[PDB]
């Protein structure tokens, strides 16, 4: 799955996907929380957590 280009607009994080103008949508806080809860124990330890 192609990753988006993340930018911070105000207090919200907006990601833009490039097509095969690029699509843009707001990443909901719930979506980010769900993704963060799937990171493995070893994965985020390598990130310093």
Q: Residue 39 carries which DSSP code?
A: S
From residue 5, how far is each of 11, 17, 18, 42 by CA, in Å?
A: 17, 7, 9, 25
Which stretch, 6-14, 32-40, 41-49, contacts other proteins (CB under 8 A)? 32-40
Determine contact, residues 35/44, Cβ cutoff 8 Å: no
Nearer to other proteins, 32 or 45 (CB): 32
**CB 26 → other proteins: shortest distance, Å?**
11
40 binds other proteins (CB under 8 A): no
43 binds other proteins (CB under 8 A): no
């Amino acid at each position: 799955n192609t990753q988006p280009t993340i930018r911070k607009d105000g207090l919200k994080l907006v990601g833009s996907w490039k097509k095969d103008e690029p699509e843009l949508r707001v990443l909901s806080t719930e979506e980010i929380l769900n993704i963060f809860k799937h990171i493995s124990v070893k994965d985020f330890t390598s990130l310093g957590f």
